[model samples]
Target: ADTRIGVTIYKYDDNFMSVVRKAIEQDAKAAPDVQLLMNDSQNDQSKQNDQIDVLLAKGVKALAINLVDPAAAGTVIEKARGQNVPVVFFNKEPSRKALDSYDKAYYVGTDSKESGIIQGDLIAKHWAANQGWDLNKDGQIQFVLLKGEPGHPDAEARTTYVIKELNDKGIKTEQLQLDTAMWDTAQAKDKMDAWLSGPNANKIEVVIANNDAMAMGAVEALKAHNKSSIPVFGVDALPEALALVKSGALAGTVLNDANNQAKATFDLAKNLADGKGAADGTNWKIDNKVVRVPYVGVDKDNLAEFSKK
Candidate 1:
């Protein structure tokens, strides 16, 4: 019973797509005639659900998905599970109940909470090093954060963890968590513009963006406010974000490697397709239940090195 593997995602415009595309290309090169089907959800839940149905109807044995919205995607997961498809949820962790509903579903992702902690640690460290002020002591260090998506586990997890880290270090950061359904850079810039005109403009010293998009957006907002020198942090070291780092705009970002996800999901799918065996939940052993790829604090010190490599 030979079969082909299929992969799907929410949108192609996303930075996450870069990793997905590379994974698909590599997998296809190695596994020729794998019958891969790549489709975009266009950020629409209904469209994503339809794509899943079509893929399932076409007999895709395993699904590697980066959901548009984890909670809104429960019904899709339920449908796929009901169809007896093996699903490997990548990048984002589903709601607990959603995971429980599907025995064949596997979640392989980064530690959203840990990423947040890292963000918090950076913020706290900066405040401590500068005494909530600047290196020259000419200004103070107050900061805000841009959460990825409202109510999304990834955003919530990262933000909550960061808050905990900040509190642990006794660093009182002035954080304004963005209330956006999704992480929108342009929207973030608009919000920052309004914030700058507010009383808190001069008080801000740092920005901890949950994702690179928001970080980039914050950069736009900073420019709009004529405060472009402020440090900004983000996750998912995308090319644009890295470019920003090289240009001495973005301070640093977490490198959540999508290449790992591509390889892991493809391996799982291919194994299942080959009837190697069902991956028993108990038998699953993670090198790290939450793998954290090594990250760096991008500053002038390493900007030259980053550009060369």
Candidate 2:
């Protein structure tokens, strides 16, 4: 029997788009009976909604969605559910906590909170070792947080964990500033530039970014101010970010497994299509609910391995 799968992503600027494309193309090549329809949402919600309707009308068996607006995606998600279409949400999860918590639809990506904690731990250790911040005791790390879309779970988790980790170590973070970039590099860079004009011109000791693109934007902003020594931490170990880490330019980043995520999403969709429960074996949890996405942590010490891939 032939299967039709539709994949939709938020934008093309993100480097991981190619990784996702590779995975789906591989799936299509291996499954000759399967047809894949791919669309770029262009970071527009209504367009993505229209794409979903069109794909459904075209008789797709499953949907692989990386949402643009987590909270606003509910209407479409519910519509797909109403039509009995198996949906697999990729890396960027929606704000439908109840739907996500129960894995009402399969989720395939890293544990966002855990990944953020790892980045936080690495940042704490980096400061303690290199800058003598005494993170284990009393110290202050004035942090500038560069966030993604305001309501996205990944950004929220990363921000929450970084604060939790720093506070757990008795380190006081002034959070000099926290701004949303809407996942735009230009916007994040401009926001950081504007922030540097404030009293915290050089007071920031650390920067926490929701993703590598934002981290890179922050890095550029720092360079413009000739402040390269400040530690910058980001999630999503993208190729460019890995290169920076290799060059001793970045502090660290979290490794969201793009390759495995793609495969897991495909397999999960296949399982659900086979009428099996989606969240049966995966260990990712938001409370007691479990899903199957794996992640890792990478820093200057082990960043080479990630860069090679």
Candidate 3:
């Protein structure tokens, strides 16, 4: 009999998740007799819920889901529980209550705080040498933050931990402006557009975003305003971001470790689909329900490693 696993993503257009999706695709192909049924949520919670039902109805033995909304985590688990299907949640993390609600549920993704700490370290390293970035020379780093989504785990943790890491390293800082871009490139560009004007314009010495897409948008706005020299930092070392970092536009970025995440996700689902435990054959850092993949910091000095891949 052919074992089947159902996979659903938050949206096909998201840059980092698209990388994850491709990695999952390649991994799925190597396992003969294990067929993956895939779907795109299209950023709709109701559509994702409906898709889960359809996949379940098709007799998939296991499931992997990237949630469109954290609020829908409970609903996805409830539906999966009814069919006794084990679920592996990736990218956007669901709440503790939702994962604990089902014994067979699990998560595979990066440590959000780790990414933040790395970004802080990267910035601190650049700051010591590039003292000229302090336009006001006030002995403080005045910056603007571009967040992914208001309550997303990665957004909140990265926002808080980056600053914490900087403080821990004895770097004085001040926030000039902050806004949410919902992780969209155009939205980030627009928010940056308004931020680049007014009294606060020249005061923004640094630009930090939760992901590279938003960071790229900031770069676009900076270029338009002819302030391309302003240092920018972000998470998710996307290919373009890597290029920008190499070209000295984006100061630095952290890798979300998408390939390992992809392997962990599919391997976990395959284990369950094959009637074994979720962590049966792999060595990922698992604590109860969540498996953590490490995040790597990338900068101009280390650009070759990530850029080549």
| Top TM-score prediction, candidate number | 3
Query: Each prediction's TM-score against the native?
Result: 0.85, 0.88, 0.97
Candidate 1's residue-wise lDDT over 1-309, tens digit each?
Answer: 436565667777666566666776686677764767778788787888888888888888778777877875477777777777777777667766777676666677765677777767766665565453453354434667776767776688877887788777765545543455267677777766777788877767777777888788889888876788788888777777888877768876666667766666666666666655434332444442222233444444455655557
Query: How well does candidate 2 score on lDDT at residue 60?
Result: 83
**C-alpha RMSD of each candidate structure in angstroms:** 3.7, 3.4, 1.1
| lDDT scores of the candidates, listed in order | 0.69, 0.76, 0.91
Whole-model lDDT, model 3: 0.91
Tens digit per residue, CA lDDT, model 3, 188-211:
999999998778997999998989
Stretches of model 1 off by over 4 angstroms after superposition:
129-141, 278-284, 287-308
Give lDDT tens digits, candidate 2, residues 38-129: 89898888899999999999988888887777665577677687678878877776554635633446566666788778877888778778
Greater TM-score among 1 and 2 belongs to 2
Alpha carbon lDDT at 305, candidate 3: 86
In candidate 1, position 288 carries an lDDT of 24
Worst 10 residues of 1 by lDDT: 288-297
lDDT of 2 at 250: 81
